[PDB]
Design a protein around this ligand. Structure first.
Ligand SMILES: Cc1cc2nc3c(=O)[nH]c(=O)nc-3n(C[C@H](O)[C@H](O)[C@H](O)COP(=O)(O)OP(=O)(O)OC[C@H]3O[C@@H](n4cnc5c(N)ncnc54)[C@H](O)[C@@H]3O)c2cc1C
Ligand SMILES: Cc1cc2nc3c(=O)[nH]c(=O)nc-3n(C[C@H](O)[C@H](O)[C@H](O)COP(=O)(O)OP(=O)(O)OC[C@H]3O[C@@H](n4cnc5c(N)ncnc54)[C@H](O)[C@@H]3O)c2cc1C
Ligand SMILES: NC(=O)c1ccc[n+]([C@@H]2O[C@H](COP(=O)([O-])OP(=O)(O)OC[C@H]3O[C@@H](n4cnc5c(N)ncnc54)[C@H](OP(=O)(O)O)[C@@H]3O)[C@@H](O)[C@H]2O)c1
Ligand SMILES: NC(=O)c1ccc[n+]([C@@H]2O[C@H](COP(=O)([O-])OP(=O)(O)OC[C@H]3O[C@@H](n4cnc5c(N)ncnc54)[C@H](OP(=O)(O)O)[C@@H]3O)[C@@H](O)[C@H]2O)c1
Ligand SMILES: [Cl-]
Ligand SMILES: [Cl-]
Lengths: 443, 443
């Protein structure tokens, strides 16, 4: 019996780690093959200067940029089976830069010895399910050998992420505008916008952080514009929030204010779409970005074909943590440890979760909900229980530190829920920490 | 009997025109379905401000930019069945802007009434050939309905182009550089580089023209770097050619000169790759960009499966013209008018064309070769013969005007080979024609 794992970001890495853990405790595991289009693992966390399409012509995956740091508390994404203490050997602050968390997630799978299951530089083209043999044919392109080939699997776990294919709306006059227009997905070095005026269309995490990054590295002026409601924070002197963009000139932007501004560049921070070009409608998840997509029993088993799974397709307050709980659950169903109920029962269960999701009003209610979801998963499994209510509270602190001051939220510290140890303050306040390297953060 | 045409650029447009022409002369034609991922026809010639991935997540197709004009004589790409005189009603100059040639190619297919065969906003996912039924299954995603479906065809003609998926080599230090790095494919408005220093990596048509465009719209400084040999032309005061880039700094570029320069942005003009993600190895053309790719009988019939065709996959001195000769040939084989020889004979014929291709040294020998190729095609077909040697000579003039002065080559005029009428001088010299619109060019 044979499993295909699509992708080697945190989620695929988690899926390999789950099986390896079960084998380490003496269980007999299926054969595993994992396909990844990049040359190395880490998903989003593997930085690249590339843009649009990669060296092989596949859409560039990572949306990450220079100077990116964790945007939530480290301790809200710690692995229950592999702690920050184990990995780094010393305590570190709470909002590590990209390279540091990349080093961290690699460390777990390095220790586990699961690299050997991965075929890198290989893009998944198609997954078909055969009624007759009751198996999946996965067709891939190996860009090392420039060969296209297919292989047969009994179950498939899709871990290809949903923050990679941009949602890019059009505004009137974009075809006339003289400056750069880009989506957040293409943002790389904040220095390219030094001494320039940047319009940021959108009001979520990308808007906040890309603006923050441009501010930090010396842009002249920043303008956020919002669709429904204002971001709400106290922005520095050279950053305004305006109602939505309506049109654009050779050099100006016009808003629902009636106001006007000369603008050098426009960065669309409008989010992403769930896009699976390697799947037909029988297997293909269709959803907007939300806490409870439909058709996923326990949020991971595909209801129209329960031998196909999805990891991490929910919107994210929790992350690494959650993928783990998902991957452990996926594995125990694949291994026959947790038999699936009937299709009617699955659908009724998923309806209950959707009813509750539509109930949610406040940030607190939302991550508490994801908290409840994760709790339900970890209770069914091998995976070590940890203090979820206490993680929720850590989120609550985090939200407060953002309300207090949006530029200084990364200068606070929190208690690890795995080890119990309060994180130290970092050696340099965020505003002044211009060097984003692992090197400089750990020294 | 039923045909699938993949793409509605010049080539797919030509393929539909070919069939329509045969029906207009009273022949019974097959059913035609043409699939196009954009919302309108024209291929490269349909401009978009978009970059990387389009509103549906498909790779953005067009490589074209603001202010692009024909880079060869108009009269070298005139349709033999639909003249510039017929379309515009007046004589026009010889290097029309993008919008003008777009208007022109649309005109032929507007007159022909072939739009009705096209499914726009539909991306081709996969083409399989079935041994049992001797037919092709084409799977597509309709982004209007968000549905994925498949349909059966007896022959397939692939017209998806080969100047869209960038070849993007890496140079040391790109992950440290502070400015924008982009491939020519992502170049949009030359105004974004006003008063800046731009490095152009490459030594072909994109290098020449993107530099030219940046110069024309007010860049501070330009640097071309070449892999094998220098471009050769006399560049204006603020533009140097130096040997290849070796590495890059936070803000500087270093060359095999040993020389150094502060640089604001890097535009890789390093060309494209043949990429067909919708095809398996049984159907998939693998080739570098050249005058005579292998495995294409008469340069269009796929030798391992002669019910599958390729249009326009050769490198291009001729263009529109050539696609016509190819499409007319494809059609006459599909229609049984020109029976295919045996596989051995096809391979031997292709070998002879390859032998000759490797003989070619000079620009003149090269386009004369493609001229001979086109001649061989049009003699086998319905398609009106026209003076190819005289078109060759028009290319020769064109090359001379480029050697004379690379910035003024677009200010010359040539004799139409269809109508025989010398083109008038344009109303504004190229350097001063800042407005790129159809509107402004025809007034
Ligand atoms: C800019 C940005 C910043 C973020 N910052 C944080 C943060 O600070 N903290 C946090 O908790 N979360 C953050 N996230 C959320 C992020 O989704 C998770 O941290 C995590 O990366 C999810 O991992 P994943 O493996 O499920 O998806 P991904 O990390 O996207 O991995 C998907 C993998 O699948 C591969 N793949 C996709 N298609 C194919 C194909 N056809 N064939 C082969 N391989 C394929 C990709 O190469 C990739 O490796 C951020 C997300 C973005 C976009
Ligand atoms: C920047 C640039 C400038 C150029 N300038 C000139 C010039 O001045 N003069 C000249 O003679 N030639 C020029 N060319 C050469 C150009 O190749 C031809 O002029 C002509 O555009 C080739 O047409 P085509 O139909 O064969 O390919 P394309 O024009 O590229 O059309 C291919 C079509 O297939 C579609 N497609 C691709 N994949 C899919 C899919 N999977 N599903 C559905 N549809 C798909 C695309 O949307 C596109 O419409 C230029 C090329 C480039 C890149
Ligand atoms: N580590 C980091 O610092 C960091 C940085 C960036 C991103 N990320 C991660 O990336 C993920 C997504 O971040 P995200 O903000 O890009 O996606 P997102 O959370 O879905 O944000 C979507 C935003 O786009 C806006 N939008 C959509 N259409 C619009 C339109 N037509 N006009 C104006 N606005 C429009 C939405 O407006 P409405 O609110 O009105 O619907 C919303 O503000 C998150 O997990 C986040 O953690 C992390
Ligand atoms: N209408 C217009 O004005 C216009 C503008 C742009 C493009 N186009 C069209 O687009 C098509 C392609 O033009 P193109 O120039 O982008 O593709 P191209 O003609 O294949 O040019 C390829 C170039 O990339 C260079 N290159 C490849 N790898 C390199 C490396 N590692 N380092 C440095 N240089 C490298 C090659 O160097 P080598 O020479 O050593 O091999 C060559 O100079 C042509 O049909 C052209 O008509 C038209
Ligand atoms: Cl272990
Ligand atoms: Cl007609």
């Amino acid at each position: 019996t044979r499993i295909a794992i699509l992708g080697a970001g945190p989620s695929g890495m988690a899926q390999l780690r789950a099986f390896q853990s079960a084998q380490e405790k003496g269980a007999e595991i299926p054969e595993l093959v994992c396909f990844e289009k990049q040359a190395d693992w880490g998903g989003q966390w593997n930085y690249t200067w590339r843009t649009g399409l990669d060296e092989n012509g596949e859409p560039v995956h990572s949306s990450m940029y220079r100077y990116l740091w964790s945007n939530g508390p480290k301790e809200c994404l710690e692995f229950a089976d592999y702690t920050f203490d184990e990995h780094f050997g010393k305590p570190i602050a709470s909002y590590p830069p990209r390279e540091v968390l990349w080093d961290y997630i690699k460390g777990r799978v390095e220790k586990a010895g699961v690299r050997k299951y991965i075929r890198f530089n290989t893009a998944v083209r198609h997954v078909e399910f055969n009624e007759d043999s009751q198996t999946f044919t996965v067709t891939v392109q190996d860009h090392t050998t420039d060969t296209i080939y297919s292989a047969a699997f009994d179950y498939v776990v899709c871990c290809t992420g949903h923050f990679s294919t941009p949602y890019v709306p059009e505004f009137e006059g974009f075809e006339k505008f003289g400056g750069r227009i880009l989506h957040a997905h293409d943002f790389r070095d904040a220095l390219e916008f030094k001494d320039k005026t940047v319009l940021l269309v959108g009001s979520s995490y990308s808007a906040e952080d890309i603006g923050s990054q441009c501010y930090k590295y010396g842009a002249k002026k920043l303008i956020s514009c919002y669709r429904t409601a204002p971001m709400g924070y106290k922005w520095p002197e050279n950053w305004d929030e305006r109602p939505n963009l309506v049109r654009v000139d050779t050099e100006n932007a016009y808003f629902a204010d009636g106001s006007s501004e000369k603008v050098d560049a426009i960065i669309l921070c409008t989010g992403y779409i769930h896009h699976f070009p390697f799947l037909n409608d029988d297997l293909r998840l269709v959803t907007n970005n939300r806490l409870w997509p439909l058709n996923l029993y326990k949020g991971v088993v595909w209801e129209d074909n329960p031998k196909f799974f999805y990891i991490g397709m929910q919107d994210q307050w929790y992350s690494f943590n959650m993928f783990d709980a998902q991957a452990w659950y996926a594995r125990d169903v694949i291994m026959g440890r947790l038999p699936l109920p009937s299709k009617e029962e699955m659908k009724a269960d998923s309806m209950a979760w959707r009813e509750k999701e539509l109930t949610l009003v406040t940030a607190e209610e939302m991550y508490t909900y994801q908290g409840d979801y994760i709790q339900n998963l970890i209770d069914m499994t091998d995976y070590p229980s940890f203090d979820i209510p206490a993680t929720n509270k850590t989120f609550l602190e985090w939200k407060h530190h953002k309300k207090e001051n949006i530029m200084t939220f990364r200068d606070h510290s929190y208690r690890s829920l795995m080890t119990g140890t309060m994180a130290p303050k970092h050696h340099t306040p965020w505003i002044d920490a211009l060097d984003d390297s692992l090197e400089a953060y750990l020294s």
